[PDB]
Unconditional design. Sequence first.
Length: 134
Amino acid sequence: SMVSPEEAVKWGESFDKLLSHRDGLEAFTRFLKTEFSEENIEFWIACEDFKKSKGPQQIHLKAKAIYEKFIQTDAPKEVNLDFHTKEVITNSITQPTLHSFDAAQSRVYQLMEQDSYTRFLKSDIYLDLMEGRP
């Protein structure tokens, strides 16, 4: 990770910037890893990894894989995903698309924003990028 304090303070005005920035996603994923909730950031990372596939049969596989692991309530991980979003997923997972979790990507994004991004801004990892005091 190599981020200038400027680019770093810039993360504190846009979670999307943070998250899209490789160094920022990295700062945030550290904060998310340390308390073991990293599978949210990697929830949609899985989805976009699946989005990288072009094989419709693989779409079924990867979608249902992410589905049963995350979208499920009865899952090994389980996401705190919006019920209406997961509802549509549960009904249309039978007919998956390149990223059937496209709406859920945004849900988990806003989840991490309101839950973790706030405290990330006050975390020593981000405050270290700030260079001042933990």
